[PDB]
Design a protein around this ligand. Structure first.
Ligand code: 362
Length: 335
């Protein structure tokens, strides 16, 4: 009934609730599933007052129900009020993972073997997403769930789009910088690159007090971009800043990561290129020598049918969004 003083009405199927995490994606608890005799994850969402949350909620539900892949979190069950009027909250039931990459990298050290396997699962999952004509747009360590068996799943597709206020900027590609457009598939690639770098050193590769500071860190490592690579268009200010800077020298990757696999550093390099047009794509990344021990196209499935929202969710008012959410969740009701 209650968790930390907040209502969490998911019984009678789900009991023994234990609080695990808050977030912009809702309140997350673990719980014992009486039916499947296993502990699960349940996410409570209360999105119906803000058109934004209703969008994020609908995208998440719709995406994860259509998606089916080993390295992508699924939805076991959705609990909500039997009538649309009473529906204030929505509980999404998902597989309970032991941790996320953010919590792991905070305190634990990864060997190359783990890093290589984690990265493989990331890209394998990302290939499926991209084949679905979908951008994740928010890849970060906290969105990568893990088991002790080292199985990994990508989660939180609340900000996904078909191929604005920002929280964390550490994993955003330089071209999106400031509050700009999440446009190409290459932005996810950049995010994976940043995630790889963090796996190698247990620290954010590109931190910054503001986006100019962040950009400076990026040039501090990659070095000054060529005029051709200076396709920073989505801001006069950001572009004029870069043009003013003195030349900056590229730091050799092995100088930053002296204990890293050379192949890992080579692939890291192709992911973290300033020019998005020059970045390696997911299928070519899976075919990189660093991942050759796991590489197998026949075992790297694509989406059975690409995505295309039948209506512009941004244009829909919150009341109709609520209707579509109600309809989408119907199949988890009796009948
Ligand atoms: C969307 C957003 N946030 C968490 C989830 C999630 C589903 N199943 C899970 N299982 C374990 C965890 C976890 C987090 N931190 N430590 C463990 N999260 C989830 C989905």
């Amino acid at each position: 009934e209650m968790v930390r003083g907040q209502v969490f009405d998911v019984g009678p199927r789900y009991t023994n609730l234990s609080y695990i995490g808050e977030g912009a994606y809702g309140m997350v608890c673990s719980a014992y599933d009486n039916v499947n005799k296993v502990r699960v994850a349940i996410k409570k969402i209360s999105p119906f007052e803000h058109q934004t949350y209703c969008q994020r909620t609908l995208r998440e539900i719709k995406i994860l129900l259509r998606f089916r892949h080993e390295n992508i979190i699924g939805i076991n069950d959705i609990i909500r009020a039997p009538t649309i009027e009473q529906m204030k909250d929505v509980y999404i039931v998902q597989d309970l993972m032991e941790t996320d990459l953010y919590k792991l990298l905070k305190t634990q050290h990864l060997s190359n073997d783990h890093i290589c396997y984690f990265l493989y699962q990331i890209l394998r999952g990302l290939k499926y997403i991209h084949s679905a004509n979908v951008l994740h747009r928010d890849l970060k360590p906290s969105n990568l769930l893990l088991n002790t068996t080292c199985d990994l799943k990508i989660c939180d597709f609340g900000l996904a789009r078909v191929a604005e206020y920002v929280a964390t900027r550490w994993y955003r590609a330089p071209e999106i910088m400031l509050n700009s457009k999440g446009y190409t598939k290459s932005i996810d690639i950049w995010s994976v690159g940043c995630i790889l770098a963090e796996m190698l050193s247990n620290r954010p590769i590109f931190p910054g007090k503001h986006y100019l500071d962040q950009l400076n860190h990026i040039l501090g490592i990659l070095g000054s971009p060529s005029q051709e690579d200076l396709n920073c268009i989505i801001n006069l200010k950001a572009r004029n800043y870069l043009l003013s800077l003195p030349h900056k020298n590229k730091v050799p990757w092995n100088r930053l990561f002296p204990n890293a696999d050379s192949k890992a550093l080579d692939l890291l390099d192709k992911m973290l290129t300033f020019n998005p047009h020059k970045r390696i794509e997911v299928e070519q990344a899976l075919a990189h020598p660093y991942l050759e021990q796991y590489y197998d196209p026949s075992d790297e499935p694509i989406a059975e049918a690409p995505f295309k929202f039948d209506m512009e969710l941004d244009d829909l008012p919150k009341e109709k969004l609520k209707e579509l959410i109600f309809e989408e969740t119907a199949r988890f009701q009796p009948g």
